[PDB]
């Protein structure tokens, strides 16, 4: 099964508004940008963002010009000639519309609440899919919390009915309307919703593990923002997933969510897969094209691992720009992202920065040593590991943030197609490190193992091991004298 | 309130079937051998065991000859005249008839399933109360497993009404008939329940601990077998009651139950107290007789935490009699229990016993130098502490097993009496000594605390406190967003 290859297309409603492919002063990235080439190499397009009004329903923003609005996603539905697997998805959501502090929290929280409230929004999202053309729905609620939840559940049931519906009636079999979200890639959000991933998850075609933004200038150390692996030396985290309203005993708990962790691209996926009804080719991983840059660092460890004095605040509190070379978060008016295009120019320019590499996390890094600045991003060479763990883990693909940053040539997306399709790309000798990899065992991927069926009427000793009704079990204490499952004594460690 | 004084009378059938006053060979403690002045130290006597048969009815052993049973029953209740207060109450179950490899088990599944089969089993009860005599039902179920527990108190329910109705109908309001049972003393078999504690205890007027047998034979280690409280160089338990279905987080678990943990009788006091629902009134401290026999254990700290030669099986395997001066070991064919008036009298025959105390568990054991033997066991000045501690803990009152093993002066059921109701017995200045307490914190004992209400709109960091719905909540990680009980950040600490 060919590898999916998601690539968000943002354009902000000024953009839209003032559309225009030949003049990058107003449009930095128009479609005009996507060539038929990378229109192959892409799966999906998630054209974002889209929002849930006061009235709870799926529309536009609404300063939107409709009619350049239209012509966007015709430019982008356009692209589909070039390749007949593409689709071109729309996004409700992101951090903006649906953070808990966001400008239409509540319209999220409202929408899910009740089945008139869910009907009348799933509706909402297949006409908006309907009238404008595109191919499925991406809802990125950033994040809904325990008691929203199961109603957050309700609706994409709702939505995968109707799109399985429109489906069938526009005889698109050969190319369904699809479902997906963006999901959580680190613990904290995760804990949100954790214990119910495989409801979340059953209606979707993919859940799009956002595993970037695990650093930034809201923590105190500087940090690899989408390691792979984790790396001893880089500061280590609570595992959120251990207090999820999961009901699991303490071995349980303690098995899967080893604490503290390094947060990192493998915890997320592993702590998928750690739950049951959550299958491998859903999971999605996303990657950045984006760096996040930190200024006032210490020397003696290429500005890993040290303190900062970055603002954290949103949007950037000043007009102090102090990312060397980077006249393009001038215009954005924020040093502290920089696209890879950017990053790119920022190291063939001579601005005193060097490209280090970390071979434990996988991931580039640029550090300034003149005025203290660190970058932490990606490129190519991390994308081929990344890629081989995609494969290796049977994942459903890859997702990424934003095609709008990715160089004039679009290196980062043509590296994700090679590693993925091109037959004269040979990975299996890729070298995947000894950094350090998420260690825990959960009730989806417990492992394979044998032991002596169960014996109702006999007495087990601590240690014992048997099998019964699917599973391997060992005793926790010493004079068991009822059955697994029944007991308290009895531990899940194995399957089959 | 007077505290309860709990003595169980056990006799086996055959000493009931040649019951008699006059011959120790055949009834070691006759009925006799309780005074009018033992009669009055006494608030209960629980006349065991009694049974559930194949019919799903409790009934005498099939064995039984039923006048001479009625006979021994009137001699309990003839102490009645010299104890206005005391009540003959007789107990169903049992280690032998109850435990999961134990004859009549099925039979205590099977009672309490369905509304009819309760019904028949709580009307058996109050017919064979009212048909011999007794004032009450005590269950001795050990123990009802995790699918059996509601079932179990839906009977304890029904026995209940029926209970508070019979004593209407016999115009009993002075002595109202009660209903009680006894629970487990230690993690291990308390975890099958734990959970649902307040309901069971709901319809009870007692619930009788069974904090004694928390070391034996069975166990690798020899240990103080009712210590009061830990000993740090003693050996220390799996908690099992994490691994209970209590639906709580990692951190409540930890902050519950600490592991490993020092199986004494303060602990189970203790994590009874720690549940909602379970008032201290209507917990008794139990306490033993007998004491436990090791062989083969080593020196350098009286026999104390070593390994030990002694079998485990049950019944005892050999002839091999190996606790000098134990005569009733002798008749009894097991050198691994013997009562208080049997150990009194070998350490009154200069058979090589030496009397030791610990003073962190505040109980005395025997050591024997030249056979390497061990004995654990309580006495009077044992429950001096255990008797202060039941009147700090505002518990109940104290229950033992049994009253056969005392004295034939009683002194272990007058020093109970003594501890609680003598005027010229003075505890106040008794010191507890510095053994280790169950520091354990659950939802029936979170302190008190004040912390600023939360506010909605606010971004916590790690560690802060707010009061918000009844409780003090803690921030377990940075950049919360969310409401107190909202989300999986927040951790109940303290009540408002
Ligand atoms: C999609 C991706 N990421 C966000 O959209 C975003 C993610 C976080 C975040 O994970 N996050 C995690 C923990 C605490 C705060 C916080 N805040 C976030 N802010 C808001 C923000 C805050 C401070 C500084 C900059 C931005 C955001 N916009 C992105 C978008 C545009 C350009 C590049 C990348
Ligand atoms: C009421 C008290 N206690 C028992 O009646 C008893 C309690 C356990 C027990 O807690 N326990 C806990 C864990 C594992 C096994 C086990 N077994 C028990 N056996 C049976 C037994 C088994 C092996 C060796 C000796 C005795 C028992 N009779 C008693 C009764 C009469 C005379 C003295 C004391």
Redesign the interface.
């Known amino acids: 099964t060919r590898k999916a290859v998601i690539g968000y297309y943002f354009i902000p409603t000024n953009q839209i508004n003032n559309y225009t492919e030949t003049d990058t002063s107003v449009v930095p990235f128009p479609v005009s940008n996507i060539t038929p080439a990378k229109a192959k190499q892409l799966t999906h397009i998630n054209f974002s963002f889209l929002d849930i009004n006061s009235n709870l329903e799926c529309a536009w923003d609404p300063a939107t010009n409709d009619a350049k609005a239209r012509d966007v996603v015709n430019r982008l539905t356009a692209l589909k000639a070039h390749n007949p697997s593409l689709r071109i998805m729309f996004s409700i959501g992101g951090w903006y519309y649906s ?3 966001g400008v239409s929290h509540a319209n999220y929280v409202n929408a899910v609440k009740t089945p008139a409230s869910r009907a009348k929004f799933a509706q909402s999202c297949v006409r908006i899919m309907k009238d404008y053309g595109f191919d499925g729905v991406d809802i990125d609620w950033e994040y809904p ?3 929203e939840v199961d109603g957050f559940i309700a609706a994409l049931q709702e939505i995968r009915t109707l799109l399985n519906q429109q489906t069938i009636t526009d005889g698109r079999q050969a190319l369904p309307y699809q479902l997906t979200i963006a999901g959580a890639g680190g613990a ?1 959000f995760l ?2 919703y954790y214990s119910k991933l495989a409801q979340i998850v059953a209606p979707l075609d993919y859940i799009n593990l956002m595993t970037y933004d695990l650093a930034g200038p ?1 923590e105190k150390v500087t940090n690899h923002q989408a390691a792979l692996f984790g790396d001893a030396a880089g500061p280590t ?2 595992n ?1 997933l ?4 999961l ?1 699991w ?3 349980e ?2 098995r899967a ?1 080893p604490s503290p962790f390094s947060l990192t691209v493998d915890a997320a996926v592993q702590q998928h897969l750690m739950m049951e009804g959550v299958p491998s080719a859903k999971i999605v991983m996303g990657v950045p094209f984006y760096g996040r840059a930190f200024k006032g660092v210490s020397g003696g460890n290429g500005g890993q691992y040290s303190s900062h004095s970055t603002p954290g605040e949103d949007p950037y509190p000043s007009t102090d720009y102090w990312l060397v070379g980077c006249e393009e978060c001038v215009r954005d008016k924020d040093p502290r992202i920089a696209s890879y295009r950017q990053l790119e120019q920022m190291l063939q320019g001579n601005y005193g920065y060097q490209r280090l590499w970390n071979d434990k996390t996988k991931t580039p890094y640029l550090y300034h040593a003149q005025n203290g600045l660190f970058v932490t991003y990606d490129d190519a060479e991390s994308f081929k590991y990344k890629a081989k763990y995609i494969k290796q883990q049977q994942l459903g693909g890859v997702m990424f943030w934003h095609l709008g940053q990715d160089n004039r040539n679009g290196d980062l997306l043509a590296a994700l197609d090679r590693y993925f399709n091109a037959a004269d790309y040979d990975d299996s000798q890729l070298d995947m490190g000894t950094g350090l990899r998420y260690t825990g065992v959960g009730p989806g991927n417990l492992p394979i193992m044998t032991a002596p069926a169960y014996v109702p ?1 006999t ?1 087990y000793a601590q240690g014992a091991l048997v099998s019964y009704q699917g599973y391997v079990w060992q005793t ?4 068991i ?2 059955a697994p499952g ?4 009895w ?1 899940k460690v194995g399957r089959v």
Do not use: H, M, P
Request: aromatic share 22%; proline share 0%; net charge negative.
């Open positions: 953070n808990d502090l919390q325990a008691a904290f804990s949100r809201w985290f609570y959120a251990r207090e999820a309203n009901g005993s303490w071995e708990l303690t969510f009427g007495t926790k204490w010493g004079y004298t009822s029944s007991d308290s004594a531990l």
